[PDB]
From a paper:
NvfI from Aspergillus novofumigatus IBT 16806 is an endoperoxidase that catalyzes the formation of fumigatonoid A in the biosynthesis of novofumigatonin. Our biosynthetic analysis of novofumigatonin revealed that the Fe(II)/α-KG-dependent enzyme NvfI accepts asnovolin A (2) as a substrate and introduces three oxygen atoms, including an endoperoxide bridge and C-3’-hydroxyl group, to generate fumigatonoid A.12 Sequence and phylogenetic analyses of the NvfI homologs and characterized Fe(II)/α-KG-dependent enzymes in secondary metabolite biosynthesis indicated that NvfI shares low sequence similarity (10–15% amino acid identity) and belongs to a different clade from FtmOx1. The active site of NvfI is located in the DSBH core and an Fe is coordinated by the His135-His137-Asp250 triad, which is conserved in α-KG-dependent oxygenases. Further, the crystallographic analysis reveals significant conformational changes of two loops upon substrate binding, which suggests a dynamic movement of active site during the catalytic cycle.
In addition, we also obtained a partially closed conformation of NvfI (monomer B, state II) from another data set of the wild type in complex with 2 and an α-KG analog N-oxalylglycine (NOG). The structural analysis revealed that the overall structure and the active site architecture of monomer A (complex structure with 2 and NOG) are almost identical to that of the ternary complex with 2 and α-KG (state III), while the loop I in monomer B (complex structure with NOG) takes a different conformation from that in the open state I and flips toward the active site. In this state, loop II takes the same open conformation as that in state I but the electron density of the side chains of Ile126 and Phe127 on the loop I was not clearly observed, indicating that the conformations of these regions are still not fixed. These observations suggested that conformational changes of the active site occur during the enzyme reaction to create a tunnel for the substrate and close the substrate-bound active site, although the density of 2 was not clearly observed in state II. In the X-ray crystallographic analysis of NvfI, we obtained three different conformations of active site (state I–III). The enzyme reaction is initiated by loading substrate 2 into the active site of NvfI in the state I. Then, the conformation of active site changes to state II via movement of loop I upon substrate binding. In this binding mode, C-13 of 2 is located close to the iron-center due to steric hindrance between the A-ring of substrate and Glu208, and then the direct hydrogen abstraction from the C-13 position by the ferryl species occurs.
Author numbering: 2 to 278
Amino acid sequence: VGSRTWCESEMLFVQPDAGTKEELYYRVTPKPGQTQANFNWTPHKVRFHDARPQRDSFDLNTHGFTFVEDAISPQLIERIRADDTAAVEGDYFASVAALVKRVTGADHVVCFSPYTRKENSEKGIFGQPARTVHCDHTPAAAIELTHKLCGEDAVRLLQSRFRAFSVWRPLVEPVLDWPLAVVDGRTIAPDDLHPVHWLRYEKKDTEPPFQLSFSETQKWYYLSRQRSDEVSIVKNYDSEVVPSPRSAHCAFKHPFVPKDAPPRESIDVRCLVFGGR
Ligand SMILES: COC(=O)[C@@H]1C(=O)C(C)=C2O[C@@]3(C[C@]2(C)[C@H]1C)[C@@H](C)CC[C@H]1C(C)(C)OC(=O)CC[C@@]13C
Ligand SMILES: O=C(O)CNC(=O)C(=O)O
Ligand SMILES: [Fe+3]
């Protein structure tokens, strides 16, 4: 069930055949009588290798994710936990942009779609830990988001290196239950990716993310006891040919934490990244 540098748990994948018949969709809030989806979630046992022994060796180009040290003020943390929208869109956005610039040397970072999450929150499934394995954007979604958020500069910006990141930070520390797991992007096969339209409304409103199916080739990681100063940067898209075109991420129930542990809290924001290495 567990060892010194790894443990076992479960995450919700999709079937390895899913999406070959027709386009997959999932309704967030189906009305009574409305079919919620044309596919089933399927849990699968996964071995989560602790990244803590090798924390600094993980790379956005090689693995598709990285862990970086970046302390922010306690006052900003409590403002974020207090659902201060101005604190998120102002100071924290600026924090995330500066961090990504530090890490990648990019010329321009655009933050969007912040999500503050709490174990068994009351803000819905997007304010709660993610239980389905996913990559936030397909190529079509990352490209669309660039036009949506950059307007006239989109074509100019897309002539250079274009990446999309999920930047994840714990709000209470250390993270024990429901940590954010990440997979080595070199161990994702093309057949593991399945676009799924997430219908927050009646009809499809954007381009879709990827959901993953399980493979034994996948090498899954987590950073045990992650602290508020340890930031996870997970690559959702990359326009350059690198060993990891993308990573994927999801949370899992840790089998060795007390039942009465306090709820996991965190904030993740997405960002478009132009330039850099
Ligand atoms: C429990 O839901 C999750 O596990 C994930 C999640 O928590 C969130 C917040 C999501 O945002 C998505 C899809 C995911 C990754 C889901 C799968 C949808 C639901 C709304 C915002 C869009 C958007 C920003 C317009 O960009 C898109 O490319 C379309 C897909 C996302 C990224
Ligand atoms: O925090 C979680 O459980 C899930 N987070 C994400 O999917 C993300 O950062 O894109
Ligand atoms: Fe995500």
